[PDB]
Amino acid sequence: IVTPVTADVAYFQKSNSPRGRAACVVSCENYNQEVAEGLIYDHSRPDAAY
């Protein structure tokens, strides 16, 4: 996965997604795709992890 050299190293010591954003849908409302896909792909908001 091609990556800017300014990726934090401390991000690579924990267990995180190989993307930049967390992509865990278990928390979100049960049957709402629009809100879930917001956690995966919407960058107007910070990821849950950081």
Binding site: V9, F12, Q13, K14, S15
Partner: protein
């Protein structure tokens, strides 16, 4: 994460001194793996559990 380092030098300190090695040297780094399997590294015959 997986055991990875930037220079062979940091893998040598991680071996000799397990607790007090530098996770970040000047421009080099080393990452120690945290996974549900705990495997024993065995370089030379000094062993890091």
């Amino acid at each position: 994460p997986a055991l990875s380092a930037s220079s062979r030098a940091l893998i040598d300190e991680f071996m000799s001194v397990k607790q007090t090695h530098a996770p970040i040297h000047y421009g080099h780094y080393i990452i120690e793996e945290v996974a549900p399997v705990r495997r024993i590294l065995k370089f030379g015959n000094k062993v890091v559990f």
